[PDB]
Amino acid sequence: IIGGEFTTIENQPWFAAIYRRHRGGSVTYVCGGSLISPCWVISATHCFIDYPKKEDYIVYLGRSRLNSNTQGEMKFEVENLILHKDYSADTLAHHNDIALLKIRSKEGRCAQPSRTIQTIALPSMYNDPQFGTSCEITGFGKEQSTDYLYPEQLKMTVVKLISHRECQQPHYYGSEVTTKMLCAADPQWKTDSCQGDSGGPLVCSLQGRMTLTGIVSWGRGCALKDKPGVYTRVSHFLPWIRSHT
């Protein structure tokens, strides 16, 4: 996250931290995710497509720090890694960028809700916030272009939803952004998601219910003028989510 604020998991308790174990036993951070039911985390297919082996991945809930333990945190393996069959990637744009991870503790159990672990509501069909709405994003991604390490503390920020009309302007993304995607950015281009934030939540207050409106997917650079963050429009994928869970 470029700019924004350091946060703690109690403020973002659906946030899932996804890592990958390597041969030799080193662990690296991959992407964020969102807990939508006790057994299911939702994320982005692009985070896993090149290494689609569920055994490689570790999922944490209730975790505020990248390489230290948080009290109340819970560690999971991936029982099922479901990638979207029509995923593809162009030069910038990623398509059907959505994935589901069925999680399981070593004891065979799903998540147990607590002060630091909670599910986030899915949106209803065809119902997204009006453009101009302020929404939040969360992740362990880069804070600046020059970072070669991710921040040790979880971050969040607030961005505004941008209309498809505006995001499809020539100096924005043109026809590369589709109606299955949502753009969001800072009007001053000072805060944004960045590499490492992918798969994380874009959450909007929708009829007073916090709702998983988007999933961090793509964008040209980070906090670049006229280059919004682009997000998987969760509301378009409800049949797919329903069928695969």
Binding site: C47, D50, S198, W218, G219
Partner: peptide
């Protein structure tokens, strides 16, 4: 890997 932005996490680029 690729360090080119959102979309490139955990990729193989030899």
């Amino acid at each position: 890997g690729x360090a080119l932005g959102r979309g490139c996490e955990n990729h193989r680029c030899l």
